[PDB]
Amino acid sequence: TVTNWAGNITYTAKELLRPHSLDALRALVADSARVRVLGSGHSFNEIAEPGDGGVLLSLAGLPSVVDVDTAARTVRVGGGVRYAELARVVHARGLALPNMASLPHISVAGSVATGTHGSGVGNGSLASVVREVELVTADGSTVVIARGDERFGGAVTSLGALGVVTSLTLDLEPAYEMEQHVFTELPLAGLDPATFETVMAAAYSVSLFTDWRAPGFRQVWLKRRTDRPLDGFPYAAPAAEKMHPVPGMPAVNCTEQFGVPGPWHERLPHFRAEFTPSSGAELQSEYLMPREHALAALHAMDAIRETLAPVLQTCEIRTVAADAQWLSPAYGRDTVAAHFTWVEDTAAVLPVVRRLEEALVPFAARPHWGKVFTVPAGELRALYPRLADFGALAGALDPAGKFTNAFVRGVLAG
Ligand SMILES: *Cc1cc2c(cc1C)nc1c(=O)[nH]c(=O)nc-1n2C[C@H](O)[C@H](O)[C@H](O)COP(=O)(O)OP(=O)(O)OC[C@H]1O[C@@H](n2cnc3c(N)ncnc32)[C@H](O)[C@@H]1O
Numbered sequence: 326t327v328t329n330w331a332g333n334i335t336y337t338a339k340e341l342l343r344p345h346s347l348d349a350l351r352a353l354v355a356d357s358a359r360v361r362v363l364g365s366g367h368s369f370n371e372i373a374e375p376g377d378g379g380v381l382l383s384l385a386g387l388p389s390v391v392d393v394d395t396a397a398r399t400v401r402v403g404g405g406v407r408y409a410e411l412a413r414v415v416h417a418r419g420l421a422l423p424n425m426a427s428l429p430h431i432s433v434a435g436s437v438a439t440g441t442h443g444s445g446v447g448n449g450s451l452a453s454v455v456r457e458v459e460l461v462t463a464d465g466s467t468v469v470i471a472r473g474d475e476r477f478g479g480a481v482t483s484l485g486a487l488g489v490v491t492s493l494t495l496d497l498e499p500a501y502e503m504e505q506h507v508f509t510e511l512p513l514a515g516l517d518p519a520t521f522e523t524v525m526a527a528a529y530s531v532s533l534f535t536d537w538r539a540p541g542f543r544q545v546w547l548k549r550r551t552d553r554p555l556d557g558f559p560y561a562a563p564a565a566e567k568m569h570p571v572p573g574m575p576a577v578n579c580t581e582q583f584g585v586p587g588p589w590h591e592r593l594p595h596f597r598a599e600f601t602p603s604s605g606a607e608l609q610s611e612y613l614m615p616r617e618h619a620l621a622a623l624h625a626m627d628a629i630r631e632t633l634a635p636v637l638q639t640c641e642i643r644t645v646a647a648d649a650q651w652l653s654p655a656y657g658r659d660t661v662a663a664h665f666t667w668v669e670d671t672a673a674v675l676p677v678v679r680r681l682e683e684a685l686v687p688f689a690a691r692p693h694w695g696k697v698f699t700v701p702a703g704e705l706r707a708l709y710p711r712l713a714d715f716g717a718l719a720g721a722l723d724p725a726g727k728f729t730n731a732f733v734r735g736v737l738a739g
């Protein structure tokens with residue numbers, strides 16, 4: 326029996342395949358009628374489900390390649406490699422990524438497939454650093470698509486619906502140091518658009534957290550580059566203690582605070598690489614909207630906070646720079662993201678998700694493809710200007726829909 330990380334999704338397991346060579350992988354794909362790839366299982370819905378008849382394919386049995394070209398400042402990484410390993414290797418060569426997700430133990434291919442991002446107003450999504458993807462397509466042939474190709478905008482954030490991504494090449498920068506400064510009790514009252522932008526721009530990456538109980542925000546996390554200036558932060562009080570994003574959880578699990586300098590890859594995530602949970606008692610949703618709607622969205626959430634709070638562990642507010650990828654929730658517009666880590670109870674949570682989606686409809690809110698959402702397919706298709714172009718690319722590379730399951734079919738058709 327195969328489950329996702331949160332344990333709310335159990336897959337229909339005809340067979341799980343774990344090839345040990347590319348030769349074996351190509352033959353298995355060509356010989357199978359329906360395939361979905363399983364990454365690290367950090368999605369919260371049926372996106373990785375093959376359905377009956379279909380095969381679930383993992384890259385865990387392949388050599389986990391991490392090939393840093395220091396001259397070119399690039400790294401070539403296998404489809405199943407996770408960020409924690411990637412980051413350690415690139416750091417040891419004196420290089421770095423521009424951003425990371427909250428927890429590093431997640432597959433690179435699976436991360437970019439759904440629109441994974443961190444925070445920072447000038448920082449693009451995790452997909453934005455990819456310069457090339459290598460795909461094993463439905464007939465077992467390899468197709469390489471790189472920045473500049475007409476098809477590239479559909480090739481990185483692809484919901485795994487084009488084929489098996491066996492390697493990706495990423496752009497790198499020189500290694501840098503960071504400090505993390507946490508603050509408590511930022512009011513929502515009197516926050517204007519200018520002060521909101523000032524707060525979110527106050528360091529390289531900034532997150533707000535709240536429990537939607539007492540008015541305002543519980544915490545502000547500033548992740549600052551030591552090679553950039555830090556101005557006084559008058560808007561909230563400095564934390565007296567080490568904090569966890571989720572009130573009442575162990576702060577030992579989190580990356581170092583109190584402004585202590587350390588390497589990028591030990592400061593961008595919220596959770597220490599030593600923290601290796603094999604499952605989590607949580608559900609997640611996130612909605613990504615035009616940045617200009619930030620204050621209006623925050624006030625809509627505040628007005629229904631009594632509905633949100635009872636089923637909420639924590640809510641995180643972030644920013645993302647406009648993305649070139651057609652299916653990125655951050656496609657074509659500078660973005661504000663509102664993330665919800667819920668309690669595990671699906672029956673209690675879904676009615677609240679529906680209400681939240683009702684409150685965010687005037688703000689063109691796109692849900693994160695890897696998280697829980699109930700936005701109807703027709704509505705969903707309308708939120709993505711280039712969704713049609715992705716549909717044509719899938720039909721071209723996979724005309725029999727080998728890599729389409731119920732989730733992808735519903736999205737495209739559906
Ligand atoms: C669990 C979790 C999730 C998470 C997070 C922290 C935790 C503990 N922090 C996030 C953050 O800070 N920002 C963000 O935007 N998202 C964050 N998430 C979500 C997570 O990154 C995503 O849901 C991500 O897609 C999970 O990837 P993973 O690889 O674990 O998931 P999967 O269900 O098995 O696969 C997801 C999709 O990708 C396709 N896939 C995977 N590998 C391939 C390859 N090699 N080739 C083609 N497609 C691939 C799957 O088929 C599926 O569609």
Ligand SMILES: OC[C@@H](O)[C@H](O)[C@@H](O)CO
Nearest residue numbers: 427570595639641664666
């Ligand atoms: O996108 C997921 C979020 O970043 C969570 O990890 C919160 O930080 C805490 O639940």
Ligand SMILES: [Cl-]
Nearest residue numbers: 513514540541
């Ligand atoms: Cl307030």
